[PDB]
């Protein structure tokens, strides 16, 4: 259990981690951007419901949807 | 110089993507692998379900005959 700081490199196959840990090497700062970049999109798979869900562009529009009360 | 529209950096959050501009110059082929690890993850959103090729369906309902029986 001695390291400094990794995680991300033991979430994948060792045929990734192997490729990504001998170029990290180099940039140990930029792989940290791109690790939460990944992780944006992983989450965009899945959206629960909050305050209407935006996205869907439309060309031709009518009406703000449903939309009578609160 | 400004550039001719730009991918996968205008488009998400931009607030980061200026600073991986300026850190992708040093490293042009390792973002290339975070590229696809990103995408790669994205269609792990489904799994290997099916079992039996899908079939029986039971939760709560034991026998419900009546006529026969014996």
């Given at each position: 259990g001695h390291m400094m700081s990794k995680l991300f490199l033991d979430e994948l196959p060792e045929s990734l981690s192997r490729k990504i840990g001998t170029v990290v090497r180099v940039l140990p700062s930029s792989l940290e951007i791109f690790e939460e970049l990944y992780k944006y999109a992983l989450n965009e798979n899945s959206n629960d419901r909050s305050e209407h869900h935006k996205?869907?562009?439309?060309d031709d529009s009518s009406d703000l949807l449903k939309t009578d009360e609160i």
């Open positions: 996205k869907p562009r439309i």
